[PDB]
Amino acid sequence: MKITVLGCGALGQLWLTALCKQGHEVQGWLRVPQPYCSVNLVETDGSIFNESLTANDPDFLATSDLLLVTLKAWQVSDAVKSLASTLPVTTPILLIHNGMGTIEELQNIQQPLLMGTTTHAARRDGNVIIHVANGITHIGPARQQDGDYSYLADILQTVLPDVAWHNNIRAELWRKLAVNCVINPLTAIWNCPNGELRHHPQEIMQICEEVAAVIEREGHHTSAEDLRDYVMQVIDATAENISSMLQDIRALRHTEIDYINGFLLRRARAHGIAVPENTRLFEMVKRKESEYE
Numbered sequence: 001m002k003i004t005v006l007g008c009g010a011l012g013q014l015w016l017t018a019l020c021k022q023g024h025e026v027q028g029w030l031r032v033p034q035p036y037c038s039v040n041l042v043e044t045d046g047s048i049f050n051e052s053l054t055a056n057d058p059d060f061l062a063t064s065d066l067l068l069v070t071l072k073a074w075q076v077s078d079a080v081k082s083l084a085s086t087l088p089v090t091t092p093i094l095l096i097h098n099g100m101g102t103i104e105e106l107q108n109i110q111q112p113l114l115m116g117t118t119t120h121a122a123r124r125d126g127n128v129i130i131h132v133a134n135g136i137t138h139i140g141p142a143r144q145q146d147g148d149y150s151y152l153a154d155i156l157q158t159v160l161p162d163v164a165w166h167n168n169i170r171a172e173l174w175r176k177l178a179v180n181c182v183i184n185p186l187t188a189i190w191n192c193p194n195g196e197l198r199h200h201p202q203e204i205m206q207i208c209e210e211v212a213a214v215i216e217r218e219g220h221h222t223s224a225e226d227l228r229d230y231v232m233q234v235i236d237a238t239a240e241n242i243s244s245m246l247q248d249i250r251a252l253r254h255t256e257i258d259y260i261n262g263f264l265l266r267r268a269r270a271h272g273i274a275v276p277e278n279t280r281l282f283e284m285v286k287r288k289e290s291e292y293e
């Protein structure tokens with residue numbers, strides 16, 4: 001299948017590497033256009049894939065069977081909208097990122113729009129990406145109008161195992177957002193690894209109560225307790241890790257907060273729910289960003 005990968009960072013390079021290993025015809029698509037993109041990936045078994053692939057070829061884009069998007073959340077929608085008039089109108093666009101709120105920015109996309117999450121882990125080490133862990137990628141329809149693109153799950157399963165189609169992708173994204181709304185800003189603010197959060201059960205529950213209330217109003221069934229339990233399982237499995245938001249903070253990079261607690265606050269406002277803890281986290285992180293930027 002012919003694929004354009006938008007965003008040639010850790011995840012994009014993972015997918016590019018994996019797609020080439022199965023013989024799919026690919027290109028990259030970069031922010032700062034160049035004719036080629038550098039893929040340097042170390043697989044879980046130590047094998048090395050170092051390759052220069054086509055990038056930013058608009059004719060290639062115009063005849064792609066899939067636009068795979070692996071940008072950070074705040075990068076996604078402007079970059080997609082700018083390619084959308086080139087991409088065939090029948091060609092699916094698959095978004096894989098953390099956070100939510102990009103789909104709301106992409107309501108007028110005429111292409112089929114698919115949302116994805118993944119538990120694979122890929123980490124930048126200089127100009128090398130390392131595939132740290134294998135995992136599971138779920139994809140589904142981004143919007144109410146988006147139809148059955150399960151065939152893509154079947155293809156991508158053979159590229160980067162495991163991939164599954166989920167019609168209820170949105171509910172899954174909301175649960176992952178709950179976890180993200182706890183772990184990312186608290187670790188960012190406290191400058192601590194994820195496991196330190198277990199010494200704050202009350203604050204964790206409070207955030208979980210706010211998010212559960214938004215989730216219920218959105219039509220997905222969950223409870224504060226269930227969200228809390230899922231948070232603790234993620235903290236337990238990542239206790240020693242530095243969160244992606246804390247990494248951003250420490251590297252003086254823009255964070256995904258407008259698509260994590262920020263999104264949660266936009267949906268809270270639209271259902272008139274008060275979310276004072278989430279608000280504090282969002283504002284605290286925005287202030288930390290303004291200390292650089």
Ligand SMILES: NC(=O)c1ccc[n+]([C@@H]2O[C@H](COP(=O)([O-])OP(=O)(O)OC[C@H]3O[C@@H](n4cnc5c(N)ncnc54)[C@H](OP(=O)(O)O)[C@@H]3O)[C@@H](O)[C@H]2O)c1
Binds near residue numbers: 011
């Ligand atoms: N990496 C993982 O293990 C992992 C796992 C699960 C989910 N995710 C999620 O996947 C998303 C991407 O993560 P990542 O780790 O791959 O991020 P990353 O390494 O920062 O990759 C993003 C790439 O897209 C580029 N970019 C920004 N704006 C662009 C534009 N307009 N056009 C083209 N390229 C543009 C970046 O280049 P510049 O930095 O030069 O702008 C970068 O190379 C995030 O939401 C993350 O939370 C990541």
